[PDB]
Amino acid sequence: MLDTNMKTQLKAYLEKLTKPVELIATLDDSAKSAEIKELLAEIAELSDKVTFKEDNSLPVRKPSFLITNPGSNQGPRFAGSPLGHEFTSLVLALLWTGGHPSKEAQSLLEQIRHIDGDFEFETYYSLSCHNCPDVVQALNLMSVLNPRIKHTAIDGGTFQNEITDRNVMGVPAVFVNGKEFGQGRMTLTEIVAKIDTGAEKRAAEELNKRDAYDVLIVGSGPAGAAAAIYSARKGIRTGLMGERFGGQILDTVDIENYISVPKTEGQKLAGALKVHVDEYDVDVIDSQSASKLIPAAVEGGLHQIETASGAVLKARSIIVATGAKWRNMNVPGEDQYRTKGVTYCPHCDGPLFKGKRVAVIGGGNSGVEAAIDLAGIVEHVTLLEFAPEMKADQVLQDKLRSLKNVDIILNAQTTEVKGDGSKVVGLEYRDRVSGDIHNIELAGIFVQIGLLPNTNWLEGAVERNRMGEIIIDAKCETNVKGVFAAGDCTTVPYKQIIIATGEGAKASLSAFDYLIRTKTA
Amino acid sequence: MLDTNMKTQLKAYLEKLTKPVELIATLDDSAKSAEIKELLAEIAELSDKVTFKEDNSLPVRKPSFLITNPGSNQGPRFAGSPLGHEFTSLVLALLWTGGHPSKEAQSLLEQIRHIDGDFEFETYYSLSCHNCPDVVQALNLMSVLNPRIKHTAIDGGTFQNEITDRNVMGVPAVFVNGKEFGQGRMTLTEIVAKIDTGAEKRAAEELNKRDAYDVLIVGSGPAGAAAAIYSARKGIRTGLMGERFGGQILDTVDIENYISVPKTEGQKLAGALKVHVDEYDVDVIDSQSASKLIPAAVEGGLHQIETASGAVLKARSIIVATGAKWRNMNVPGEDQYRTKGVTYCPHCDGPLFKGKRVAVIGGGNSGVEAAIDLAGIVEHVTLLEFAPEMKADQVLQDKLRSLKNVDIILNAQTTEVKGDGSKVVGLEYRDRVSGDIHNIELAGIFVQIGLLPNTNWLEGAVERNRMGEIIIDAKCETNVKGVFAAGDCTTVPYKQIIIATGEGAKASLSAFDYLIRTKTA
Numbered sequence A, B: 001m002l003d004t005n006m007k008t009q010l011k012a013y014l015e016k017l018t019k020p021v022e023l024i025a026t027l028d029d030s031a032k033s034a035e036i037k038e039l040l041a042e043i044a045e046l047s048d049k050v051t052f053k054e055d056n057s058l059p060v061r062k063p064s065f066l067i068t069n070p071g072s073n074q075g076p077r078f079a080g081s082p083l084g085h086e087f088t089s090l091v092l093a094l095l096w097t098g099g100h101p102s103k104e105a106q107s108l109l110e111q112i113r114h115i116d117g118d119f120e121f122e123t124y125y126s127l128s129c130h131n132c133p134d135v136v137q138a139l140n141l142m143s144v145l146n147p148r149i150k151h152t153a154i155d156g157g158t159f160q161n162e163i164t165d166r167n168v169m170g171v172p173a174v175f176v177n178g179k180e181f182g183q184g185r186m187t188l189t190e191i192v193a194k195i196d197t198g199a200e201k202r203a204a205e206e207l208n209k210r211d212a213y214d215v216l217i218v219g220s221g222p223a224g225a226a227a228a229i230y231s232a233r234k235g236i237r238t239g240l241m242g243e244r245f246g247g248q249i250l251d252t253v254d255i256e257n258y259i260s261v262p263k264t265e266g267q268k269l270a271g272a273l274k275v276h277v278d279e280y281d282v283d284v285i286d287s288q289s290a291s292k293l294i295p296a297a298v299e300g301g302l303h304q305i306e307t308a309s310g311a312v313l314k315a316r317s318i319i320v321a322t323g324a325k326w327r328n329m330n331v332p333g334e335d336q337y338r339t340k341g342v343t344y345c346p347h348c349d350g351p352l353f354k355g356k357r358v359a360v361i362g363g364g365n366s367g368v369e370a371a372i373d374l375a376g377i378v379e380h381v382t383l384l385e386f387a388p389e390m391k392a393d394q395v396l397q398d399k400l401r402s403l404k405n406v407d408i409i410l411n412a413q414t415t416e417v418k419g420d421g422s423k424v425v426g427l428e429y430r431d432r433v434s435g436d437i438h439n440i441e442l443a444g445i446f447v448q449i450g451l452l453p454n455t456n457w458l459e460g461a462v463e464r465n466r467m468g469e470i471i472i473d474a475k476c477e478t479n480v481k482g483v484f485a486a487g488d489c490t491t492v493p494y495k496q497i498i499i500a501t502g503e504g505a506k507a508s509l510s511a512f513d514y515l516i517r518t519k520t521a
């Protein structure tokens, strides 16, 4: 059935086999069966690595044959004649079964190899169809690669019954698991995309595929964004990963101390940050949390960051910019009146309360100094301390107790923030000793209970001070070579947007200098 | 001439005298002279501190009399009758000559006292003029205060010749040094404003008059402006003094790394800074240079700043934010092509030269690292070093000499920057050893010769590092209590706008904390 040319090419290609191949035929008494039996015997003659066997008891189309390895029943089946245009397909199926490599990208083949699901493909062709072979070959390859993907290529010229029955009006025509699948010149990639959709596959899988970063910035508030802009501007491979782009500013309304901008809003400032970052094609990763830092085992190595989602990213340098949580009172009304008189920051909102009465919650240094600060510009301040005594430095306590527009209330626990539906009008608190409930009328409540830097995930890796802050020097260096930190999560002494952005720029320039100096190759 | 009421009031008011007064009359034979002689003798009777003398040889109007002290010839002269409405003026002139205080503000009297110039005032009045006395009194007071300011109040009813001759058609009518001066109800302030204009008086005099600041910020670039905004927002008395508001950004065009602002220009950013500062009514002083810091002699005292103009300002805290000068090549073409390809900053302009050829001038760490930095994103870098060897760390030199798109030229001195009338196209340099002249074609020249912090005026007062930078800690504290520093003039390791603004905010919050803690009264 092979002319002498086809036969000369085949002996050559068959030399390329590294594994034995069996051709297992299941035949009837038709001339077509005789033709197939002749072909398979002629192929087996061309190589000791190919053997032809017959099993006419099998419950499969007649004539058909399986291409497989000894001991195995895996591989493509041709039903009817595999010559005409399909000769190339037959040869390729032999080569692949016998160990010769495919020319497809190995990542694609590995994907096919590990497709989880059972798929029985059937493809109708005709011998004179110029376009069929590419499709037959793609599905053949899939069946060689994955025992759960089966393929029977069917010669419509032999099984004309099925052509009419299934109303196949054009070829190549593909079926899967009893349903029509597609027609025409589809590619292996397109076929896989249809059966292995990637629908509802986690971002973590994709994150594991990322190459190593030159710098990976963890946290995407103003410090991280600044760092990302400075880094990408130098042309290095810059990743910026964070839980929520924008950080704390996203949840604030009015901002009047972002230097050069008399008044803006948090959401707008966050959006401006995103535009600035995106000008430089930073790889921005959102809704991910770093859960562990694995320090590089050698200078010039790679640091790694594990995510809570289970991914691992790698980088030559890291900038940690995870900021802080600002502790809440956790009382009714607090959330309702955030931005409407409940505030966590005297530097930010102090000026809004000129001529108003306010409270400060907390009698540590922050709270006491906040109270002394506010007492300079507001009508009246009441400081509430939960404990029986203030914790602030004695000089501050003495200074506060000397102000005439200040009341200090000890053993006081806020029980509710009160407003009028739009703004704060007072607060209610309980004396923790007597249990008595009291009320103060006011327009503002400055919560000064404490900050919780977002740094517990670094315990044991990066040195932190007694308050949880990452210890940095003026260059934003930490105790780990190639790890830098910027913004509120650090020992930087004040926590403001303009301060954080400055620090992010510094940390970025330090990381860059570090990269220059550890390319000692 | 005095009724018994006028006479009873006078004896009382005359008790208030602390110095002897003489009334020196120059008379003729008219009834008017007899009236004046009678009045003066009647006044002298009322008090041992008042004496009446006559000198009819003097070359002055007749009748007239001078009000003065013994041994002196200084004071106001009344020509004709000083009764009617002018009685109050006569009494006041007696009281002032005899040591009783004026009710005017003493700063006004001190100004009058020290007016440099000779002014001979004459004022025409009439006895029935209700408005004249205030004017007569003002000029009388001036003559009591300053011997160079003379005043003769003239009774137009007595010297009617002069009324017609000088065409005085309404009173009060004032002349000075032979010229008409003014008519009507002018005030002492208005009179002084006309003869002691303050025209071309230096700003230094006005600066010496300022009260003490809570914070005085020296230098008004981005660091100082940020500091001023943070300070004024706390309601404290905030001064911002500098040579030129805006600092280095004023002379730059394109800025693409002021975080959140993808692209702006220097002049526009400087103007935005001015608007933000002015929202808080900072006392902004421009075109002044600090020439010396005098540290407070005690905690809670006042620091002082001398200016080159000779003023001295005082403040409870100081923030030094004077930035740096960026050293130039000082060669033809350099100034012409500033902003058009000559740049002093790889962080700022690096991205603009993607795919271009550039040079770096200077082979210290900055220059060498700048070159390695740029070599990552530009087509080619040539580094020119003036000396026979680079001064950079060996690791950097080794890294630079391994890059394939880099040439290093030693003993090289730039002689000219070349452009096409709008942008840089090359540079010319001389080999300092052989004297040979060579040319390089390029689009950018990064000058990395060095920074000169604006801090020599602090030598001996504030500790500086080996490069002239003010040594600060993370809180922007210096070695002098109550003196802070921010921005490029400090040991902050990188020199950028966003970094400087962050630092200014920090220094401001530190100064505020310092003020809270040194109000130990």
Ligand SMILES: Cc1cc2nc3c(=O)[nH]c(=O)nc-3n(C[C@H](O)[C@H](O)[C@H](O)COP(=O)(O)OP(=O)(O)OC[C@H]3O[C@@H](n4cnc5c(N)ncnc54)[C@H](O)[C@@H]3O)c2cc1C
Pocket (backbone or CB within 6 Å): A218, A219, A220, A221, A222, A223, A224, A241, A242, A243, A244, A245, A246, A247, A248, A249, A251, A252, A254, A255, A256, A257, A258, A288, A289, A290, A291, A321, A322, A323, A324, A326, A344, A345, A348, A349, A454, A457, A486, A487, A488, A489, A495, A496, A497, A498, A500
């Ligand atoms: C209500 C409010 C109003 C404020 N108003 C002002 C104002 O008017 N002016 C001003 O100057 N300052 C203001 N501040 C303070 C200012 O917002 C912060 O100082 C600033 O945002 C700090 O920036 P940052 O980048 O260091 O940290 P953040 O803004 O806190 O950003 C850190 C980011 O990293 C994320 N992150 C945390 N842990 C991880 C992790 N493990 N992995 C990945 N990502 C993580 C966080 O979710 C966050 O998105 C305000 C703060 C609050 C609470």
Ligand SMILES: Cc1cc2nc3c(=O)[nH]c(=O)nc-3n(C[C@H](O)[C@H](O)[C@H](O)COP(=O)(O)OP(=O)(O)OC[C@H]3O[C@@H](n4cnc5c(N)ncnc54)[C@H](O)[C@@H]3O)c2cc1C
Pocket (backbone or CB within 6 Å): B218, B219, B220, B221, B222, B223, B224, B241, B242, B243, B244, B245, B246, B247, B248, B249, B251, B252, B254, B255, B256, B257, B258, B288, B289, B290, B291, B321, B322, B323, B324, B326, B344, B345, B348, B349, B454, B457, B486, B487, B488, B489, B495, B496, B497, B498, B500
């Ligand atoms: C040409 C050029 C372009 C630049 N482009 C950028 C850019 O794109 N992005 C970026 O981030 N950075 C850029 N920079 C750097 C940036 O401008 C500076 O880092 C920044 O301005 C530093 O701010 P500063 O307030 O510390 O000092 P300065 O801006 O230098 O301001 C200090 C001010 O104090 C004044 N002063 C000095 N001595 C005294 C004295 N004795 N008394 C009173 N006042 C005094 C100075 O005259 C000056 O006005 C550029 C610099 C240059 C030279």
